[PDB]
DNA sequence: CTGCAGGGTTTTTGTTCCAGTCTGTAGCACTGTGTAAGACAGGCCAGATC
C-alpha cells in the first residue's frame, strides 16, 4: 500500500477478497461483497414492493407473513411494511 | 514565451483458447376465462262454439 498507494489499507484491503474468490467461485460473492459501505437498500422504494405485491398476487396477510419472516431472519428489514403500502 | 507534431511513458481495455462452474432462458405438451335463456315450427288434444 506504501509503495504504491501510499498506504490507505481500507481501500486495499476491501478489495483484496474479490480475486481470491473470484478466481474460481460463486455469485454470491459478487453479493456480498458488493452490499459493503456504498450502496444500498435501505428499503425497497414502496411503490416497487407495491408492485411485487399486486402484480404477483399477494394476499396482504401472506405479504405481512413475508415481511415479518425476512425481517426478524437477518434482517435488516428490506420489504416496507402494510401502512406506508 | 507559444503552437502542435509525434515520439517517449505508464496504465486502461481488452484480446485469443482450453477446462470446466454457475445462471437464466427457451424447449417441453399444455392450461384459464367465456356457462342460460327463447324462438319457430308442427302436431294435436282440449274445449268452446253452435
Known amino acids: 500500500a506504501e509503495k504504491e ?4 489499507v481500507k481501500s486495499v484491503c476491501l478489495t483484496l477478497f ?3 474468490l473470484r478466481a ?3 455469485h454470491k ?3 456480498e461483497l458488493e452490499a459493503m459501505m456504498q450502496g444500498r437498500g435501505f ?3 414502496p411503490a416497487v414492493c ?3 405485491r399486486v402484480n404477483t398476487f ?3 396477510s401472506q405479504y405481512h407473513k413475508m415481511y415479518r419472516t425476512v ?3 437477518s434482517g435488516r428489514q428490506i420489504f416496507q411494511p402494510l401502512h406506508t403500502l
Not at 5 to 8: A, F, N, V
Request: charged fraction near 20%.
Open 5 to 8: 498507494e501510499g498506504g490507505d
Open 18 to 20: 474479490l480475486l481470491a
Open 24 to 26: 474460481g467461485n460463486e
Open 29 to 31: 460473492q459478487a453479493d
Open 43 to 45: 428499503g425497497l422504494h
Open 50 to 52: 407495491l408492485a411485487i
Open 58 to 60: 399477494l394476499s396482504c
Open 71 to 73: 425481517k426478524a431472519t
